[PDB]
Design a protein around this ligand. Structure first.
Ligand SMILES: Nc1nnc(-c2cccs2)s1
Ligand SMILES: Nc1nnc(-c2cccs2)s1
Lengths: 546, 546
């Protein structure tokens, strides 16, 4: 009975294998067969390639040595060698060509999900090429999905030598009969078999996946589309910035490149972006997912006026200043979406681009009080319930577990109408005291939000809704302006509060507005349809935010 | 008696003023004089320019309106208007041309240093141009040097209207007789005078600086070259990453662009890079200045083996992985310099570039014990004193204030030889119990290091020196390798331990090695000669690390 799975990198997790490269280059350049291949393997264990795979020498030191082998493989080949030719040029190209085998990676993720210990055991080198980043990026993406990554150049042992397998078993803390081993090389498989490890010869992915699933007893092939990678809070980089004497903002940071600032709504967390953070980081961006003021590890001052839009926006500007960022792309959801439009309207120079999920840009109505405006429609009734201090805090605070389980639901599962809330006298009056756990969420995920809200409660978060009059006055200054910086509005078909039709008139203030639409999507866009959200944002960032 | 100084931005802190632009463009394009100028000012207070300066409209909304004024200034000019002509093109160019007036900025820094309240009061606009980053970058750099930045577009008031001056006094919390006001526009000065504020008409910098210093009584002109900008710990972004269950690394982060990782030596702090962090961030890099394991806010495990180079390097690799960085430029000093060479030797793919201050790359001597090697020379005697656990911790821990004051000295001031340390039986046996405060440091700076070392002490820091045998064995694996990635070695003339001559043979392992040399520089390079260090690193980063 297995509990561990081991994968090779070249030809198993990454395709096409370089092995094909020398062979394919031979065919295109019409040199004698295996000639390029002999150069690679000249001297076998005492040769330049074995020294390279053992970490004895770097790749750049190896290039002239391999080129050496081409002097003589050819002398003994009695075949003319072309100029314009570079060993370096071929390898550069072949490595650039290697991409992750997603179905294989998906199978490893599934095994690990079912309590399997996964590892990568590979024959690799120390890469010092000017172009080394490409490979390093590939390794960075792959390694985080496995319990272990064993590289020959770091351990000083190579496949097929038996000590590396005995080394792997040690790291795994498992007996060979408990190990599945997948490799594209016959010679490298043989020593694992001698130890009694289960082996798979990888020739083509579907067949190897067939052998893997029948031996494991887990469905790996034809599986429903998986969920994007999610963050483990304990494994993130946690950032803290004091924006003013009593205000400290907490954020989570991942990736390199242009700064993308993620702004959650009510009653959320930086954690509401768990599916977006790794996807956006992998897409070539530096993600900063905030704990907005009043939430999680960020300061939660009691005063209502500390949560007016003008004050909230100034703090976001200070946050950028203190991090040394002249600009950031601002992506918001719900309340964060509202703040994000106002960031674009009042600080266009500090905003690289603006994107909103569900939240339409609402211009201030001069000659109509926000109370009359909010009162016109039955959907925004919950906002009136939030007006008087203590009432909503008391209801939301009583059972944090029930609060999050009732709120975080897909459109089909909804347990609360949100109308007649003031009349019902509660957000949870028609709700079970022990709600069913939604398909969108996990018990562990619910517990995380419970842990976050236990510190400061709902007072600061509810205060965002208690500055209606102040926000109206401030917004009246931007009445003559237009948003002319890149902007994206993403609508969710099944959001019954932030309805897609509410955004129809947006082009009047935002002429170059780009749109995204998500079907069968409730209010909680990020967790509801993570794959679609990630595709829209990434495609938009790449075209509009560099 | 003054306590506050106010500066205009255009023509005062930033040169050349845009005012010259329309005038200069007129001369080059031979259009009637002031024609371009009338277009700008058409309608005065009710005009497009006043609406723009009040934040009523953005710059992109303003462009067609100004262009409007050119229809008619010209109709009433009876002069032909050229095609290929863009208002946008002229303004783009003029704004790009505006650079900080360093002598003016230096005078403001000096006033603030002497307890003055400094502010920027400017007539500006909301910039939504595709090229807005350039201006935002300029503002980001300037604003951090002043107590306040008052912009007309944010406050909705413009100069010369009297309400803005009454507004400024309010923000300053000062009476007009206590305020110096500097402007390049005569009309804008007049309302400040009416309030009884001290005024300076800025025409050329030297003369205005002359008037400023005679009224203030502070030396501003001809002053000795100033120290680079330094970090205030309380105002930095503090980052925390768990690299393993019991190990957490703390770092300070500033700027955007390619990741530059700063590694301090013994017995230092991320704070030892205070002069480099803002300079490197301003130069277009993302600075991550670490608290190395055993120091400050980072975990300090008691076990000696937790500080061997192999373990320390793996943790730096994990730190990058957890931040989502495939690479970082690694800059080290002392012990950090040693770690940085080993990062280049063992993880060349994760290192964008490597730079060392004082620390030469020391290859392992096979067939010579590190103890014999260290023992060959009298300079490394302090390393033997550090060998036995508790002895050096007890001496260094007794008076933290005395410890840092004795150690942190320029070459001239040195209070300790470092030879006969084991014989003297102490690092401080020939030292005053109340040492003089060095020119390199401030009492407040000393107190910061005292605060940092009070938490974990000297055990973890001293452990870096207690893995001699282990480090030797590990380094013996890299004996066949060479460092072929971009590398910079910076030597300090007056470092009597990490002597420049010790680096002579470095080109043998590092062929493309670039060098920097600093004269009259002791062991503490970063604080000793901050200006030179910053110039060498920036010039090197720009040519070799993109
Ligand atoms: N309670 C509130 N509902 N909407 C508000 C708005 C603030 C700014 C634009 S709309 S405050
Ligand atoms: N105490 C020590 N002195 N030098 C050491 C070295 C470690 C690695 C290269 S040199 S350990």
């Amino acid at each position: 009975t297995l509990r561990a799975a081991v994968f090779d990198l070249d030809g198993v997790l990454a395709l096409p294998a370089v092995f094909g490269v020398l062979g394919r280059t031979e065919e295109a350049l019409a040199l004698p067969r295996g000639l390029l291949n002999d150069a690679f393997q000249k001297g076998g264990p005492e040769g330049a390639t074995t020294r390279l795979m053992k970490g004895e020498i770097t790749l750049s030191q190896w290039i002239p040595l391999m080129e050496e082998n081409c002097r003589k493989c050819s002398e003994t080949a009695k075949v003319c060698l072309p100029k314009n030719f570079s060993i370096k040029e071929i390898f550069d190209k072949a490595i650039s060509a290697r991409k992750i085998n997603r179905p294989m990676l998906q199978a490893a993720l599934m095994l690990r999900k079912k309590g399997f210990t996964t590892a990568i055991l590979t024959n690799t080198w120390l890469d010092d090429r000017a172009e080394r980043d490409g490979l390093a990026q590939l390794m960075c993406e792959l390694k985080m999905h496995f319990d272990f990554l064993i590289e020959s150049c770091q351990v000083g042992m190579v496949k097929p030598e038996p000590q590396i397998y005995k080394f792997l078993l040690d790291t795994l803390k498992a007996s060979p009969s408990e190990v599945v081993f997948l490799d594209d090389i016959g010679a490298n498989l043989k020593p694992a078999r001698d130890l009694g490890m289960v082996t798979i010869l990888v020739q083509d992915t579907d067949t190897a996946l067939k052998e893997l699933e029948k031996v494991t007893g887990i469905q790996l092939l034809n599986t429903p589309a998986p969920l994007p990678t999610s963050c483990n809070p304990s494994d993130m980089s946690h950032g803290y910035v004091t924006v003013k004497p009593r205000v400290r903002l907490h954020f989570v940071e991942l990736g390199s490149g242009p700064a993308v600032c993620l702004c959650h709504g009510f009653p959320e967390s930086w954690y509401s972006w768990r599916y977006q953070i790794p996807a956006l980081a992998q897409a070539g961006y530096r993600v900063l997912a905030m704990d907005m003021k009043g939430y999680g590890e960020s300061s939660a001052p009691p005063e209502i006026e500390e949560y007016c839009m003008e004050v909230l926006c100034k703090e976001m500007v200070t946050f950028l200043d203190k991090l040394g960022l002249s600009q950031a792309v601002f992506i918001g959801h719900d309340w964060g979406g509202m703040l994000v439009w106002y960031m674009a309207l009042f600080y266009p120079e500090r905003v690289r681009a603006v994107a909103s999920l569900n939240t339409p840009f609402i211009p201030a109505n001069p000659n109509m009080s926000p109370l009359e405006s909010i009162k016109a429609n039955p959907v925004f009734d919950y906002q009136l319930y939030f007006q008087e201090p203590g009432v909503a805090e008391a209801e939301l605070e009583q059972n944090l577990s029930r609060t999050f389980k009732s709120l975080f639901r897909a459109s089909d599962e909804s347990v609360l109408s949100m109308h007649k809330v003031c009349e019902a006298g509660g957000l949870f009056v028609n709700s079970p005291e022990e709600p069913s756990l939604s398909r969108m969420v996990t018990e562990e995920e619910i517990q995380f939000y419970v842990q976050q809200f236990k510190k400061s409660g709902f007072r600061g978060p509810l205060n965002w809704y208690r500055n209606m009059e102040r926000n109206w006055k401030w917004a009246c200054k931007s009445l003559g302006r237009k948003i002319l910086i890149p902007a994206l509005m993403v609508t969710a078909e099944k959001d019954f509060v932030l309805v897609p039709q509410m955004s129809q008139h947006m082009e009047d203030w935002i002429p170059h507005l780009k749109r995204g639409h998500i079907e069968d999507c409730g209010h909680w866009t990020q967790m509801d349809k993570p794959t679609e959200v990630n595709q829209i944002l990434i495609k938009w960032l790449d075209s509009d935010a560099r």
